[PDB]
């Protein structure tokens, strides 16, 4: 979670703070695709184990 995955802020709330939807949409898109990819890796690892 702490990792940014290319995004400019770790905590999503800090992004919400000043970044506006025109840029916030793309920023959160990058962040959420990164986090979801990490969760996908974790669930796959759990599946094999």
């Amino acid at each position: 979670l702490s990792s940014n995955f290319g995004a400019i802020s770790s905590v999503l709330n800090d992004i919400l703070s000043r970044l506006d939807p025109p840029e916030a949409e793309v920023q959160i898109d990058r962040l959420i695709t990164g986090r979801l990819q990490s969760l996908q890796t974790y669930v796959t690892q759990q599946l094999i184990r």
Partner: protein, 50 residues
């Protein structure tokens, strides 16, 4: 522009980020710019709610 901020943007006429259309503008000096100075046009810069 979708999501841009400003007095015209948030106070006058906002536009969704999912907007699907065209913005077509041209200088209207030959039409609007006159000796009267066309001050009838107004914007609502100050407003309680965007």
């Amino acid at each position: 522009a979708p999501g841009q901020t400003g007095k015209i943007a948030d106070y006058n006429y906002k536009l969704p980020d999912d907007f699907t259309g065209c913005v077509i503008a041209w200088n209207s000096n030959n039409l609007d710019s006159k000796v009267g100075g066309n001050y009838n046009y107004l914007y609502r810069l100050f407003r309680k709610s965007n």
